Write a protein that binds this ligand. Structure first.
Ligand SMILES: [Mg+2]
Ligand SMILES: [Zn+2]
Ligand SMILES: [Zn+2]
Lengths: 26, 289, 433, 1116, 91
DNA sequence: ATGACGCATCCTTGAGGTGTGGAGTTCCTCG
DNA sequence: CGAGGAACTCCACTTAGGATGCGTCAT
């Protein structure tokens, strides 16, 4: 519980990771 | 039969310089992170790939078992941990092949290394055959019967931004733009000379009109663009049997080639003033109807 | 219009869309509209899948050679139907023979009528049919022999140009797309039962699916093995037909269900090649007994049946491309002398070359027997594992390639579009480069 | 409330029952759930009227179920009790404009008690903040509106299927029992005469093995069922005997590798099948099972019994035997026959309240688990209900449902009708229902069980045909979950006034008459042959005395968003479907006006919706000012009706309200004191009336297109107004807190001239693409502080600004003018997650006029797109000079199969130039006179029923006898056509033309948003390809079929050009643009990056892939 | 680029493939948003996410090209080198 | 205060979900 | 080794995040 719920930003979302991440290389 | 099949596998092991010593694995490699990365989603969120989680858990089990056997614990727990490590690697390489696939936050199964490749949404039939391209506009189609057979009408906005580079070439060449950034500025701001140069550049530039369900060869063709007003693409009225592009509010895609070699091929083999003949049964397709 | 669950309405709609319609007739009508909409929606992607299969198979069938020089050719009936003795043109000449050029100098009365290596148009055909012929011989792919694949003159003229096929034309994709495109337009289903089932073979796109994949017809009829005296040995538990083929040939017997619609009589005579009961004959069976020409004719006729009964017209060159690419491999029997395992369904080319090599070394050759598979199996039976990996069965074909440790050269259009290098076809052929 | 604009009625048949409420489907269910006073009033009304309603509230049952929770010993116990509600801390508008939610706290009087102590510690604890609905029927959540749809999922119980095995060529049968919560049962027979049972989806087991596992054995198997041969053969197949042996072997097979014991098998079976805490057989499920199997009145909320299993065995074995009728187990005569799937006697409707109840039940069970853990842990006589109870699971469940589920979904607020139909979707998709692919084609098709409960015409046009839809107009959800239908009863050959409610199965038990069947002076139907209906879509007539029921309204099967079409009996199924689908994406218009031709579901469909403001108080108005209409009642109270003046909707349209009355008027209850968007005088107003002339004209209308007149660019007849939004906010970050200030680093004064000191543009100034909306900046930044640059800065001696502009940015491709601004901060009691400093919500509102390329349409699916715009004189003109407004291609009318628009056009003209039938003495004249719609002034809008509209000869005669323009100037010929001149040349066109007036919509398929092109923009990360998406300046999907096309054409270089350089790499993408901007020859292609990731992933799987050349490693 | 051939691999082959190993079963720091040692996304084993920079403090300058840091074990290389470097677990 | 450490509270138990369809095939248990 | 025949493997594929164990080491 203290390993996960503390800053529980770790989300294994596949459906909103490849389209939602821009590319720095122009 | 049981002899021959076994014997062909043995045959595969006869000449090949391989060694089945590697058919049982003492290690497992890990993909680089940029191909399975995490990102800082707003609100402190961290969107992570599933393969990241699978590698995390198998590494956890590896560490736990190595530390347990570092001291020599009783064999039952050691064997249980070994079989759990085996099962973890099994799920990693193919989560759904054996047993209940391992899930993540929701009830949906995670994705293994043998799921990001196969299937329609993998790599082969999703990312290598067809790669989404630049200089590729789309808009609504309206019939115009004031066009030569080799002609199409294109609104001024899509023309401004598509041919923007050639437009810039001519503004710089005409010395309207002292520098390239000034050329950017006048492209964004818009002047009468800008549309004049756009009308100039649309000439002698075959443009590949295209529709979505390209069922036959005569589904993508070339045309010559004329700068029509409005906000819709304009089409000849006897190519709407090749594209099957009827006006129920449909929409049409338009592409542009970059190499002058592509321009020559598009004006020779593609241009719809020569491809009057259907490719199936010989008969002309672009005839009055 | 068809009633619910593809039944027949026991009352028509007695009016048009102008006079006036009550509401229950509109409700009845919308059944078929919804059904057809669903058919269109799914058949879009289904026909897409079928053209994917045919594109995978019919790739690398691009012409490379200009000429081969054969005299062997296909024999085509050019003008049938002499009911009143009049020699007049046949109806389907346009898709069968037309644009298929000539090889010989056909002579009827001591004078060359149709010269050699000339396009077979219409005026020459009228001259020939006035002369009195009922046959012609043509260069074709189905009989062409070449060291580098297929030559130009055997095909003919590209229908989309009228001029002769340019050497290098990617005929394969043209054939695949040509066959695939009208697939969306077939949409002809059994909307009314009519008190018939089972015997009604799959109709429309499924028929092409089945015939290009070499699967046994659903109501596959048995095929005759050898000519001779046939009779019935039916049993209440199993109906059975037994034929003793004459001239010292072993009896052949086939069991059939109760409902058969048998087209063969009791104690009658059968031919070496002919049907036995209602139902499409398996292509394998007609390959077994009647060599090659009979099976090519059967396949072409059966696919053209659906295509030209729907309403769309396609020249048979594309179908014959498909069939020549399908009927390719040979199973091997008595294989000990040739130093290879029996079976394995090996190709014609390497089989003939290696038997020739062993005969040169002295060993007698190993017997062979041609066999035809489906488009999918042939595609995944490739010699370049990358194309089969791209097509389907990625993990399986991957482990085949991993065990067998095979390698793929740059042969293949799809293998070349994956890597992203100039494909050798149309214009990318090195001859123009 | 008969206070509507006059619509002269062309109707011919009245109705017994007018249209009931349109949005009861949400409000009544939620009243049942929360059980407010309206629920109690409705319950008393149902009781005194003896109707079918849920007697007890959802939350009361849900708290009763989980109430008596105790430990292993029963020492300490917790028990909940009745429910109470407290008014909200917010208002609806407050919630909407302050990012709050419509929440209300819930109270329960919990109790803690010790059996040995005898003390009861009664207490009251708040059960969190439950969400409520508005009067409309929606649900306000997180600053937006939402709707929970009705559902459609197969009911629970038993299902008999008769399938065919192909290889064996045999008739197999399968009884699949789908319970509510537990595990499914499968019972297969006739595979080899070996009846068997499969459980948990594993290998099937002989039935008698489990029949021994229960209290049955071989002896009574011989005694009772010793008559059906298949069961006897199965008994021959039996091997083991004894209940303990049965339990042993079943626990062996279901749980291999574990000690098989009596306790283990007994516990497993009783927990999985006979435990009402894990197997909560549904009330609907129990009722259906009882009626199916004859189990008369068991425990209504019980679990399965062995009696049920033997009943299933009896049903299956008799189905094998072909027995027709049987005596139900503890029941009477019932039928034996296999069952279908998609008949609505097998699908159930989960309403809103049942959904919220289910999720709250999950939350309550989780809270019970935690409470049980703690109370088992906690010391005795030192705990209170306020101490051991943490309702965090319940709140988590509520938030989970209202934020994550796929049944709480957005509203569609283009117009009132969009929402009105959105609250009536019978969505069969979702969790625990069906799916696109797995579900075949029997579900996706209509069914004779759709005769007034699901619109056969209305449905999405795509993959989902048959999955989603819209409720029929005359619908009311059953408490269990079903659709009742209204009917008018026929008895002894005559028909009574009272209305009846019937569902799918009882509908199938009846014979159904027809709506527009002519009614005689005597109530009994006159004609001897009456065209009625029968079971399963069996059409047939009856002499008349044997007819049982009849149809109340001929707009029943059609929904409320499709009954508005005029002349719906003169089209094809596809065109009516297309019109229904594409009459619900129409943008509102500034000068919204009711049609000249329509039907009586504009007033009802604009009043029963929400956006129209109504006066619920009889009295006299004092003032009708700009915004606040102030009224004084007969009772003597002052009420300030505020109006929604130019407010935003979900998609970005406008909901602007307007006044209808003056400041000296009397008002009764429920009278429309205003109008919403797309509504005039309290009638739905989607489009406008334009004059049409049917001609081919220069080909500018080739293949179903439309050409318009510039009149409608001056009059602004067809123009709309949209409202975009921007919700920006600053975050505390780690590099100092972000502020919203005018002080944007190093910007010119003109760009921030419109900006305010706080950093928002003036409320009213214009905005165009390339402007700045809100000024935002991060105070600190670690931009460039490497030692070399640090030394350079130290030498320079000037401190550069580390701030960076985080300012909001109006999208490129939009114009507008500000409608309003809202500002919020953490200082106020507003609710905001952490980090966010200042919140700004700026709404922008634009006006658009009709333009070429903007899609248009009509009410009969006669779709099209604007081709070209021409001056007023270019288009033709009639004999008195009036031009024509629109011109359509007459080639589409025959082929597309919709001859139901010509009549609309003719009636529109008839209305627009009023006729005069003052005693023509013709038959049609007498009919139209006894109807009374004979004399009509020039402009009185006409109303035509969807299935009782204007006929033909009446239309022709009306066109013959219109009012002359001058002395004897009856303008158009008596046969529709008109001697329309030619504006272009001047000569009359060779022969007459057909002209009139038609109602044209302006669909949401705009042309500016559609227009889209890309040169260089954003990419993806894992694959270096241009983004796939319309809204993000994406490319195009050059898929595989287009590659096939380019191969077939032989164009090799072009295919390579646009499959490696144009995208999917880095060097090519940069170099094409670079060489272009500096003007050199186009460089060479390269290797795809997709290939690189492919080989890397192949490497990771240990497949030793490598690239080899003729010499090994060649040039890459 | 003339032929494509595949087979199988062993531990020697994988250590030929890879650069390092991984034993810490978790991602980068959630406090300072920085990577770690011997874990996933580790700059020691996978390529540095920040280009012309290293993990600790010593080689953030631009004039360092491809050299190895003395304490954090990161070669100052491309960000795209984070797409090519590889590691393994040894069970 | 978190995310770490160093242990370490006498009665003992999941949870739901799982409604196609197509032929390939190969083992595997029974003639 | 010769039977049924039922698993196993391919292919058709569209929003915000329910905690502790308590105590305290260390910053
Ligand atoms: Mg269309
Ligand atoms: Zn040849
Ligand atoms: Zn360092």
């Amino acid at each position: 519980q203290r390993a996960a719920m503390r800053h529980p930003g770790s989300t294994a979302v596949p459906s909103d990771e490849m389209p939602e991440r821009p590319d720095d290389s122009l | 039969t049981r002899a021959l099949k076994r014997l062909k596998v043995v045959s595969a092991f006869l000449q090949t310089s391989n060694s089945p010593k590697g058919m049982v694995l003492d290690c497992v490699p890990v993909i680089p992170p940029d191909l399975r990365p995490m990102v800082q989603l707003d609100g402190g969120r961290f969107a992570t790939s599933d393969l990241n989680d699978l590698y995390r858990r198998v590494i956890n089990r590896n560490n736990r078992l190595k530390r347990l056997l570092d001291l020599g614990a009783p064999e039952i727990i050691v064997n249980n941990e070994k079989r759990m490590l085996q099962e973890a690697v099994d799920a990693l390489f193919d989560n759904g092949r054996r047993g209940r696939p391992v899930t993540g936050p929701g009830n949906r199964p995670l994705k293994s290394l043998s799921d990001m490749l196969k299937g329609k949404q993998g790599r082969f039939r999703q990312n290598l055959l067809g790669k989404r391209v630049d200089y590729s506009a789309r808009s609504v189609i309206v019939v115009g019967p004031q066009l030569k057979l080799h002609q199409c009408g294109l609104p001024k906005a899509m023309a401004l931004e598509l041919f923007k580079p050639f437009v810039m070439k001519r503004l710089v060449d005409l010395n309207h733009a002292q520098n390239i950034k000034s050329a950017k500025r006048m492209v964004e701001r818009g002047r009468t000379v800008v549309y004049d140069v756009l009308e100039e550049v649309i000439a002698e530039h075959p443009v590949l009109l295209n529709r979505a369900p390209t069922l036959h060869r005569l589904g993508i063709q070339a045309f010559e663009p004329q700068l029509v007003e409005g906000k819709a693409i304009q089409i000849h009225p006897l190519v709407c049997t090749a594209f099957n592009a009827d006006f129920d509010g449909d929409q049409m895609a338009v592409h542009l080639p970059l190499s002058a070699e592509a321009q020559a091929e598009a004006r020779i083999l593609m241009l719809s003033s020569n491809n009057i003949l259907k490719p199936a049964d010989g008969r002309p397709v672009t005839m009055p109807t | 219009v068809s009633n619910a669950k593809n039944e027949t309405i026991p009352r028509p709609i007695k009016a048009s869309f102008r006079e006036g319609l009550s509401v229950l007739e509109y409700f009845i009508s919308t059944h078929g509209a919804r059904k057809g909409l669903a058919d269109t929606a799914l058949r879009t992607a289904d026909s897409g899948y079928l053209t994917r299969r045919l594109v995978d198979v019919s790739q690398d069938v691009i012409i490379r050679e200009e000429d081969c020089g054969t005299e062997r050719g296909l024999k085509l009936p050019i003008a049938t139907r002499d009911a009143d003795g009049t020699l007049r043109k046949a109806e389907d000449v346009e898709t069968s023979v037309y644009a298929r050029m000539l090889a010989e100098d056909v002579v009827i009365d001591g004078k060359v009528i149709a010269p050699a290596n000339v396009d077979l148009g219409d005026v020459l055909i009228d001259a020939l049919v006035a002369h009195g012929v009922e046959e012609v011989k043509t260069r074709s792919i189905l009989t062409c022999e070449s060291q580098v694949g297929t030559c130009a003159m055997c095909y003919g003229r590209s229908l989309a140009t009228g001029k002769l096929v340019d050497i290098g034309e990617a005929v394969g994709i043209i054939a695949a797309q040509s066959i695939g495109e009208p697939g969306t337009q077939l949409t002809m289903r059994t909307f009314h039962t009519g008190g018939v089932a089972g015997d009604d073979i799959t109709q429309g796109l499924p028929r092409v699916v089945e015939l290009f994949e070499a699967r046994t017809p659903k109501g596959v009829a048995p095929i005759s093995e050898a000519s001779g005296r046939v009779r019935i040995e039916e049993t209440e538990k199993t109906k059975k037909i037994v034929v003793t083929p004459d001239d010292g040939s072993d009896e052949t017997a086939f069991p059939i269900s109760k409902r058969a619609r048998l087209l063969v009589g009791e104690g009658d005579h059968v031919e070496v090649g002919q049907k036995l009961t209602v139902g499409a004959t398996n292509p394998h069976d007609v390959l077994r007994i009647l060599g090659q020409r009979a099976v090519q004719v059967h396949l072409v006729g059966e696919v053209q049946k659906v295509y030209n009964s729907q309403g769309v017209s396609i020249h048979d060159k594309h179908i014959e491309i498909i069939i020549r690419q399908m009927l390719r491999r040979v199973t091997i029997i008595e294989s000990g002398d040739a130093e290879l395992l029996p079976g394995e369904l090996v190709e014609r080319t390497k089989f003939e070359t290696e038997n020739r090599r062993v005969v040169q070394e002295g060993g007698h050759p190993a017997s062979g027997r041609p066999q035809l598979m489906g488009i999918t199996k042939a595609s995944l039976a490739t010699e370049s594992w990358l194309s089969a990996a791209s097509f389907q069965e990625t993990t399986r074909v991957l482990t085949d390639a991993a065990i067998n440790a095979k390698s793929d050269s740059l042969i293949g259009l799809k293998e070349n579009v994956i890597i992203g290098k100039l494909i050798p076809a149309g214009t990318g052929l090195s001859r123009y480069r | 409330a008969s206070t509507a604009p006059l619509r002269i009625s062309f109707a011919k048949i009245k109705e017994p029952l007018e249209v009931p409420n349109l949005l009861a489907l949400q409000t009544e269910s939620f009243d049942w759930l929360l059980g407010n006073d309206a629920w109690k009033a409705r319950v008393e009304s149902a009781l005194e009227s003896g109707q079918d309603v849920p007697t007890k509230s959802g939350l009361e049952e849900i708290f009763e179920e989980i109430s008596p929770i105790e430990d292993f010993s029963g020492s300490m116990s917790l028990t909940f009790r009745d429910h109470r509600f407290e008014p909200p801390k917010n208002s609806i508008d407050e919630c909407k404009d302050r990012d709050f939610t419509y929440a209300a706290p819930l109270f329960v009087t919990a109790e803690f008690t010790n059996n040995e102590t005898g003390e009861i510690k009664s207490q009251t604890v708040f059960m969190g903040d439950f969400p409520l609905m508005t009067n409309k029927g929606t649900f306000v959540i997180n600053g937006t509106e939402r709707v929970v749809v009705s559902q459609l999922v197969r009911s629970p119980g038993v299902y008999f299927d008769s399938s065919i095995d192909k290889t064996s060529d045999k008739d197999i049968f399968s009884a699949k029992i789908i319970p509510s919560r537990g595990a499914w049962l499968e019972m297969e027979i006739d595979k080899r005469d070996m009846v068997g049972v499969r459980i948990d989806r594993k290998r099937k087991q002989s039935v008698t093995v489990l029949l021994k596992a229960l209290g049955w054995t071989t002896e009574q198997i011989l005694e009772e069922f010793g008559e059906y041969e298949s069961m006897r053969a199965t008994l021959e197949k039996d091997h083991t005997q004894g209940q303990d042996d049965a339990l042993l072997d079943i626990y062996r097979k279901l749980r291999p590798g574990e000690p098989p014991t009596r306790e283990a098998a007994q516990t497993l079976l009783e927990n999985l099948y006979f435990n009402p805490k894990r197997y909560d057989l549904a009330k609907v499920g129990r009722y259906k099972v009882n009626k199916k199997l004859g189990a008369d009145e068991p425990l209504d909320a019980g679990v399965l019994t062995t009696d049920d299993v033997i009943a299933t065995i009896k049903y299956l074995v008799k189905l094998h035997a072909g027995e027709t009728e049987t005596v139900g187990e503890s029941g009477r005569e019932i039928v034996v026959e296999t069952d279908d799937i998609d008949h609505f006697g097998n699908r159930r409707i989960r309403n809103v309240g049942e959904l919220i109840q289910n999720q709250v039940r999950t939350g309550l069970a989780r809270m019970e688990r935690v409470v049980r853990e703690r109370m088992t842990t906690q010391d005795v006589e030192a705990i209170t209900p306020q101490t051991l109870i943490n309702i965090r699971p319940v709140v988590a469940s509520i938030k989970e449902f209202f934020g994550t589920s796929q049944l709480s979904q957005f509203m569609d607020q283009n117009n009132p009708l969009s929402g009105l139909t959105h609250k009536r979707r019978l969505n069969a998709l979702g969790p625990g229902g069906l799916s696109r692919e797995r579900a075949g084609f029997e579900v996706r098709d209509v069914h004779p069980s759709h005769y007034g409960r699901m619109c056969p015409i209305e449905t999405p046009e795509g993959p989902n045909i048959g999955l989603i839809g819209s409720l029929a107009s005359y619908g009311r959800i059953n408490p269990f979950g079903f659709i009742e239908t209204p009917y008018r009863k026929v008895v002894e050959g005559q028909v009574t006034d009272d209305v009846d409610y019937l569902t799918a199965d009882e509908e199938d038990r009846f014979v159904i008459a027809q709506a527009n069947a002519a009614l005689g002076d005597d109530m009994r139907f006159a004609e001897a042959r009456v065209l009625v209906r029968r079971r399963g879509g069996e059409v047939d007539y009856v002499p008349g005395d044997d007819v049982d029921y009849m149809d109340v309204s001929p707009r029943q099967m059609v929904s409320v968003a499709t009954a508005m079409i005029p002349f719906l009996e003169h089209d094809d199924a596809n065109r009516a479907l297309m019109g229904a689908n594409m009459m619900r994406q129409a943008v509102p218009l500034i000068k919204s006006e009711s049609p000249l031709v329509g039907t009586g579901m504009e007033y009802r469909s604009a009043a029963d919706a929400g956006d129209v403001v109504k006066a619920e108080k009889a009295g006299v108005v004092q003032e009708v000012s700009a915004d606040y209409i102030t009224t004084t009642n007969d009772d003597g109270t002052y009420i300030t009706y505020r109006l929604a003046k130019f407010s935003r909707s979900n998609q970005g349209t406008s909901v602007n309200q307007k006044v209808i009355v003056a400041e000296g008027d009397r008002i009764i209850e429920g009278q429309v004191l205003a109008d919403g968007p797309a509504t005039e005088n309290g009638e739905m107003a989607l489009g406008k009336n334009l004059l049409v002339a049917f001609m081919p004209w220069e080909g500018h209308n080739y293949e179903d297109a439309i050409i318009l007149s510039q009149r409608l660019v001056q009059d602004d007849v067809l123009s709309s107004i949209h409202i975009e939004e921007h919700e920006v906010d600053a975050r505390d970050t780690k590099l100092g807190p972000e502020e919203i200030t005018r002080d944007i680093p190093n910007v010119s004064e003109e760009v921030l001239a419109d900006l305010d000191e706080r950093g928002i543009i003036r409320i009213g100034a214009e905005v165009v693409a390339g402007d700045i909306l809100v000024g935002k900046v991060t105070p600190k930044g670690e931009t460039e502080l490497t030692p070399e640059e640090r030394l350079l800065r130290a030498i320079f001696g000037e401190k550069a600004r580390e701030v960076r502009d985080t300012s909001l940015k109006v999208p490129h491709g939009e114009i507008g003018k500000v409608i309003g601004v809202r500002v919020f901060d953490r200082e106020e009691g507003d609710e905001l997650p952490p980090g966010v400093n200042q919140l700004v919500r700026v709404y922008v509102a634009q006006k658009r006029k009709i333009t070429d390329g903007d899609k248009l349409a009509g009410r009969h699916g006669n779709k099209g797109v604007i081709s070209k715009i021409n001056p007023i004189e270019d288009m033709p003109f009639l004999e008195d000079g009036t031009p024509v407004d629109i011109i359509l291609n007459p080639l589409a009318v025959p082929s597309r199969m919709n001859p139901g628009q010509v009549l609309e056009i003719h009636l529109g003209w008839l209305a627009s130039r009023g006729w005069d039938v003052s005693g023509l003495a013709e038959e049609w004249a007498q009919r139209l006179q006894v109807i009374g719609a004979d004399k009509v002034e020039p402009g009185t809008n006409v109303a035509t029923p969807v299935f009782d509209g204007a006929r033909e000869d009446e239309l022709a005669g009306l066109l013959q006898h219109t009012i002359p323009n001058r002395d004897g100037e009856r303008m158009v010929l008596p046969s529709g056509k008109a001697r329309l001149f030619d504006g272009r040349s001047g000569e009359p066109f060779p022969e007459p033309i057909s002209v009139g007036y038609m109602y044209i919509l302006k669909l949401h398929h705009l042309v500016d948003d559609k227009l889209h092109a890309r040169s260089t923009g954003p990419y993806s990360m894992i694959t270096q390809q241009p983004l796939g998406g319309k809204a993000q300046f994406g490319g195009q999907r050059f898929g595989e079929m287009e590659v096939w096309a380019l191969e077939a054409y032989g164009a090799a270089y072009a295919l390579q050009e646009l499959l490696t350089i144009k995208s999917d790499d880095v060097t090519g993408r940069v170099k094409v643009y670079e060489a272009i901007v500096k003007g050199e020859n186009i460089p060479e292609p390269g290797i795809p990056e997709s290939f690189k990731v492919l080989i890397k992933e192949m490497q990771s799987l240990c497949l030793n892939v490598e690239v080899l050349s003729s010499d090994g490693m060649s040039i890459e | 680029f003339d032929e494509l051939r595949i087979g199988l691999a062993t531990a020697d082959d994988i250590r030929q493939w890879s650069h390092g190993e991984v034993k810490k079963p978790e991602t980068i720091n959630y406090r300072t948003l920085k990577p770690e040692k011997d874990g996933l996304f580790c700059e020691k084993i996978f390529g540095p996410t920040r280009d012309w920079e290293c993990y600790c403090g010593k080689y953030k300058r631009v004039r360092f090209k491809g050299i190895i840091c003395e304490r954090c074990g990161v070669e100052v290389t491309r960000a795209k080198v984070r797409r090519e470097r590889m590691g393994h677990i040894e069970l």
